[PDB]
Amino acid sequence: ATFEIVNRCSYTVWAAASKGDAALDAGGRQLNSGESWTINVEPGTNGGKIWARTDCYFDDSGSGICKTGDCGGLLRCKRFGRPPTTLAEFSLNQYGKDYIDISNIKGFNVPMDFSPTTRGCRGVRCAADIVGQCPAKLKAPGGGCNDACTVFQTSEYCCTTGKCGPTEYSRFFKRLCPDAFSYVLDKPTTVTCPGSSNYRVTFCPTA
DSSP states (O other): OEEEEEEOSSSOEEEEEEOSSSEEEEEEEEEOTTOEEEEEOOTTOOSEEEEEEEEEEEOTTSBEEEEESOSTTBSSOOSOOOSSOOEEEEEEEETTEEEEEEEOTTOBSSOEEEEESSSSOOOEEEOSOHHHHOOGGGBOTTSSBOOHHHHHOOHHHHTTTSOOOOOHHHHHHHHHOTTSBOSTTSOOOOEEEETTOOEEEEESOOO
């Protein structure tokens, strides 16, 4: 499956793509304002994620640091990134179909649109200004908006026991971005697509 990753933000981002225990394609790359990066993801990739990292410094061997989304100081990411991170999530060719969603379960850093470029499903979008409206206690000094699990580490926010419900904090994300997961047991907003669809992830999809 090809994913076109497009940076429409006015600032540089460093795109990242991973399935948790391995990179997808090269795993990571700088995208200046307007650039596009096409990657190839193995069919049957389960639990893949794509996200943006902001305000990064890499040296010539590709080691450094990012203010949001850092995945162990690497340009070419092999694991998931440090919250806060808006996430495009997908599982491909799962009994004949692809499954996509956007999640705010790990916070929000960059607005995002995640859409198929082939026939037969709709995209999802989380483009509201969540960083500017963020509740005071979720604001990340480093940039972005934390989820409540990251800030408070309680069973209720992390859904440790499998029994959680919605909270004042998850309801903030849900009000700003109804089409993204706001907490673990949120009513699913997953989109089912034909198996072997292709996709575009756009950062800052609107003006």
